[PDB]
Ligand binder design. Structure first.
Ligand code: HEM
Ligand SMILES: CC(=O)N1CCN(c2ccc(OC[C@H]3CO[C@](Cn4ccnc4)(c4ccc(Cl)cc4Cl)O3)cc2)CC1
Length: 403
């Protein structure tokens, strides 16, 4: 047989056409990625089933007798830094996942997120004040990127001289290219060091930020976060804030720009924006694939996935399955986006959803409300998509402001 290589351009060039080809053939198929065998789930019901099946583990630290598996997200990571990237919610199974998420939810609340709205709006304004009212700028470098970064650094207590460097490290981590495994491995060690110092300074000089809060947080029955847990959680929260929202803002900007009809609806009806963000996420989900490990043999969509297999649930392909979303290839701000898998499903549902939504809505609202003539600086076909199945995105998007 012929087995798909997730590394081929087929998974980075007009890739939603490949996903449809696979899904129509077999919703759960064996593939190859980074020179390793895995199972790609492209169908909606299959993705949902897999995400809900706890026999499919999210913990990369677990050792199985005779099995030695290296999951793609940890390409080139030395075991010690891997552990630092994997001692948090998303890399745990119950009951560890349960308490870690419980303790963090006590401080990472909707109240804390909502309380930052004026600041998020203030930051958005300033950024837009300095881009100009005429010419072609890189809306990603000048807007989509700095906004999320300033927000997360304030939430976490990351100073000005720290950002930027950290940024080039997380960008490297986003690519899983076997030829750069060393460089990727190095950037991961830098991020881990950075975080170690951040937490150390924070313990020494307390404040009212989220990190300070996580350090003192404790529960009667669950106790507190150990040093390692605290470190890994911080690294993971900082990582998400630095990259997740950028993809949303940038992709969102590109979609509204390429869909005048949809944009106009938003402009006319501001109350339409919240669901517009939901459609953007469903259309081109940043976390294209999520990973699971079959601790036991599991049957998904009529296919038995052998024990000790690595499953790549393609959240993005699932969002374009006609059985769930009719005319999935149609970007429609009015569509019923209920049930999409861009924020996860089950126990690992994205806990940063409130923050992502706030930043996304405020940003696009300001961008488009401020520049009623905003247009794309390049040919839509010439847009370069980041080659990452971990977090899809656009690193450079030239837009013309005045016309
Ligand atoms: C557009 C933005 C975002 C998208 C599309 C997104 C997507 C996801 C997905 C798909 C998962 C589930 C992973 C899995 O099932 O393996 C997840 C988990 C998570 N996300 Fe996000 N996320 C976004 C923003 C953020 C932000 C901004 C934060 C935090 C500051 C965040 C923090 C997390 C955390 C901590 C988890 C793990 C939850 C758990 O395992 O219980 N995410 N996110
Ligand atoms: C077994 C195995 O290999 N697994 C199982 C665990 N899975 C998993 C899922 C989510 C997860 O989230 C951690 C948090 C920290 O940031 C994110 C990514 N992100 C962005 C928005 N929401 C999530 C993230 C995650 C991984 C990487 Cl490399 C980069 C990034 Cl920015 O997830 C961490 C691990 C996937 C890997």
């Amino acid at each position: 047989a012929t087995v798909p290589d997730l590394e081929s351009d087929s998974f980075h060039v007009d890739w939603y056409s490949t996903y449809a080809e696979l899904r129509e053939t077999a919703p759960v198929t064996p593939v190859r990625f980074l020179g390793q065998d895995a199972w790609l789930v492209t169908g909606y019901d299959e993705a949902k089933a897999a995400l809900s099946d706890l026999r499919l583990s999210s913990d990369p630290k677990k050792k199985y007798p005779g099995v030695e598996v290296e999951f793609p997200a940890y390409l080139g990571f030395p075991e010690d830094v891997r552990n630092y990237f994997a001692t948090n919610m998303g890399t745990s199974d119950p009951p560890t996942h349960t308490r870690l998420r419980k303790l963090v939810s006590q401080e990472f609340t909707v109240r804390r997120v909502e309380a930052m709205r004026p600041r998020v709006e203030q930051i958005t304004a300033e950024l837009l004040d300095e881009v100009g009212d005429s010419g072609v700028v890189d809306i990603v470098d000048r807007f989509a990127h700095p906004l999320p970064i300033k927000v997360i650094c304030e939430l976490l207590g990351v100073d000005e001289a720290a950002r930027g460097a950290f940024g080039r490290w997380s960008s490297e981590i986003l690519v899983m290219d076997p030829e750069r495994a060393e460089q990727r491995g190095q950037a991961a060690r830098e991020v881990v060091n950075f975080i170690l110092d951040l937490v150390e300074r924070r313990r020494t000089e307390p404040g009212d930020d989220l990190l300070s809060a996580l350090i003192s947080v404790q529960d009667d029955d669950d106790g507190r976060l150990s040093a390692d847990e605290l470190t890994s959680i911080a690294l993971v929260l900082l990582l998400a804030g630095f990259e997740a929202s950028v993809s949303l803002i940038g992709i969102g900007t590109y979609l509204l720009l390429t869909h005048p009809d949809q944009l106009a609806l938003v402009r006319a009806d501001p109350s339409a924006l919240p669901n517009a963000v939901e459609e953007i996420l469903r259309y081109i989900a940043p976390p294209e694939t999520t990973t699971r490990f079959a601790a036991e043999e599991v049957e998904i969509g009529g296919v038995a996935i052998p024990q000790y297999s690595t499953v790549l649930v393609a959240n993005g392909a699932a969002n374009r399955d006609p059985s769930q979303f009719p005319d999935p290839h149609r970007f429609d701000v009015t569509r019923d986006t209920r049930g999409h898998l861009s924020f996860g499903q089950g126990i690992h549902f994205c806990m940063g959803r409130p923050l992502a939504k706030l930043e996304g809505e405020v940003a696009l609202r300001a961008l488009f409300g401020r520049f009623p003539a905003l247009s794309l600086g390049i040919d839509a076909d010439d847009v370069v998509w980041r080659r990452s199945l971990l977090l899809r995105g656009i690193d450079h998007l030239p837009v013309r402001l005045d016309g």
